[PDB]
Amino acid sequence: MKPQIRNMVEPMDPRTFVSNFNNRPILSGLDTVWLCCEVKTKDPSGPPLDAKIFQGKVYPKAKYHPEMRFLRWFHKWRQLHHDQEYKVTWYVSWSPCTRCANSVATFLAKDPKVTLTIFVARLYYFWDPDYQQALRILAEAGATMKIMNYNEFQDCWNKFVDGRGKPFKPWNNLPKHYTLLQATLGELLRHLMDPGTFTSNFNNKPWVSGQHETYLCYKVERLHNDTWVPLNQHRGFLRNQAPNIHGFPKGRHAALCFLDLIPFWKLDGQQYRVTCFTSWSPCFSCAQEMAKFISNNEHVSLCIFAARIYDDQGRYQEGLRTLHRDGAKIAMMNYSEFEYCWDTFVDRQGRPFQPWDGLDEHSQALSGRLRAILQNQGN
Amino acid sequence: MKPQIRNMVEPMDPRTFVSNFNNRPILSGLDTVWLCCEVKTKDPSGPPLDAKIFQGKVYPKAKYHPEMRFLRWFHKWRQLHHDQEYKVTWYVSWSPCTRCANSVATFLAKDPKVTLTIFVARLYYFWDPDYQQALRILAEAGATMKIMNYNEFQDCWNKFVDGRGKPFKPWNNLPKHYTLLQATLGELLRHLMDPGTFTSNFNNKPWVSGQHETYLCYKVERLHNDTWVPLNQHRGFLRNQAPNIHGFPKGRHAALCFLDLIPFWKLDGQQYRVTCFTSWSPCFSCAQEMAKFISNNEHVSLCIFAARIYDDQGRYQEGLRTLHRDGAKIAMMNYSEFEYCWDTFVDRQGRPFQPWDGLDEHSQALSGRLRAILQNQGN
RNA sequence: UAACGCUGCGG
RNA sequence: UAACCGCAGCG
Ligand SMILES: [Zn+2]
Ligand SMILES: [Zn+2]
Ligand SMILES: [Zn+2]
Ligand SMILES: [Zn+2]
């Protein structure tokens, strides 16, 4: 063999990084794509082998796109290095196009020893059908598609930016932008839920659970002459964001993330039915925000199916009554809803829905509780 | 003499007004232009006669532009009312187009009894040559072109918005946007300065003034093979913004407004020489900001001609030395510069520059003072 | 900020 | 946020 010295990264200046890796989902003015690649081996506890920055205008003629430049460089690198399994990581500012995605899928087919992971700052044309198809080509060829969070921005700053020892300072709204982008990516990749996660979290057993977490599957329908027709695109599932110093410092409940996601869809003036299936009914704060949302969204009909009633140390009845008295339709999941969620949102791998013990009894009991809560008048 | 009832305006809801009248100079997403007109008689102590809101898409098929719809409405309105002098005021979200500007000029020529004043929220395509030509067509046909400030936004909110009694709440950065837009409008209409104002402010007599104030005329040239050639557009003059609760609460010195204006020009990577003529040499804070600006703009050469040395309660020498030691070229206006400013930026109305008594003597004295200030020792 | 630019046809 | 949209050729 012949030895190749590392090639210490020629870094980008801080202002270019701050401008080009701002993860505001809708951001105009960026004409260049920046890609920061790093090649390691199977072992993550061994120092990286090589890191290189590529850039390029987003102009058609994908020949000069940074993904193609990386492909050329890394073919050379592979011919010059030991033949073993390698793990490439990308920090790319925009999501790739169809042409580059097909080239990458082809290369991964040719070189099955390379595992590629892509962290994107922003999703590029996530509403355009063909860029969604590009993301699917990539995910299908093996690559792991992810959104850059605070940790990946910090690491990119450390490894690829001319910070001069100064620490990475995050911008305003980095967690909210990350939440929106992660949800949209889950939609575009049609990400399905872990079977065990589903059974553990959606079990309508009254309280017997672990530490409280809320899972929310969502789907959209549109009105067409007194019958609802599905919208296959805006469907998926999310969970509550736990408190995080560099995320949401006090957390974000599932319902709040969901109400954040709805306006990002940029729906029409037509009537939409947004249905969700939550393992816990909304808390009081969630209920207040959903009431305000319904109060201010004429064309949106909220259907809430809870698997359990969350008792928020007292406020649950009042919150449920406000939510019922302000617009939302609220039901408790019976068998049919659990089976539909298992079929639609769960990575069932072909296995049918196994009903946990006592499902129908628990569903009827929860229905009775909800009926008593709603019909308990005040004055 | 058949009577016409006023026609109480059907107001726009606060959502639409807040979105469409935000005065961020570069604002995408607004496809409609909203225009709120009000007709008075030639008397501010008499209640307005009529007020009407028009709206319309911004693109061609100019028939449906709100400017044309107002023209049609107001021709009829004139045919139905007493023939006298009228004062029309517009609050329009975007500056008008060439077709509408020509129609308005035509109407103003046909109907000389109408005086039209236009307050624009944002300048529409202020870099496109033809929209600037439209602004010039309007100003020359008689119309008074202005930018909406806080008072005009509050007035629009009261007279045309469904505020429901709530007071007008201003958005973030309204004064800064106003300054950018006011300077750009003065450039596009090539507004010249009052002769008396020039003589009063640029007199290089040492201190003898009133509650004095700093005026800054500015010009840009660009380099082409060892000779500087003019840029006729980015030339004009501004003054310091006095403290204002609804403007800059503490004020904005002329030099700071100028350094704010420079990046709005969106200059190139080519070398530009930006020359200014200020009635007062920069204060200490101005000097610090200009030093940092030069520190971060490689391609911009600042040439400062001061008519007087401002004695900033002690710190003027250190400020001037910092400005000199950080990039800026500093001179005192001799006769030639005063006459050039009189010719270029002053509404001289044809008459030549009359040099005030003792000009050359004062210029020599100020030049000597500046030379002594710059050539003072360090350690 | 629905997100590279120029040149055009139309709505 | 250089700022209505679709279609079409090129950088
Ligand atoms: Zn590409
Ligand atoms: Zn909650
Ligand atoms: Zn028009
Ligand atoms: Zn100052």
Numbering used by the authors:
A (entry chain A), B (entry chain B): 1 to 142, 147 to 383
What do the study authors state?
Human APOBEC3G (hA3G) is a member of apolipoprotein B mRNA editing enzyme catalytic polypeptide like (APOBEC) family, and is one of the most effective antiviral host restriction factors against exogenous retroviral pathogens such as human immunodeficiency virus type 1 (HIV-1) and endogenous retroviral derived remnants on the human genome. hA3G is a DNA/RNA cytidine deaminase converting 3′ target cytidine (C) in 5′-CC-3′ or 5′-CCC-3′ motif to uridine (U) within single-stranded DNA (ssDNA)9–15 or single-stranded RNA (ssRNA). hA3G has two cytidine deaminase domains in tandem, the N-terminal CD1 (or NTD) and C-terminal CD2 (or CTD). The ability to bind nucleic acids and form oligomerization is attributed mainly to CD1/NTD (referred to as CD1 hereafter), while deaminase activity is performed by CD2/CTD (referred to as CD2 hereafter). In this study, we describe four structures of a soluble primate rA3G variant from rhesus macaque, rA3GR8/E259A, in complex with AA and GA dinucleotide-containing RNA molecules in the form of ssRNA and dsRNA with 5′- or 3′-overhangs.
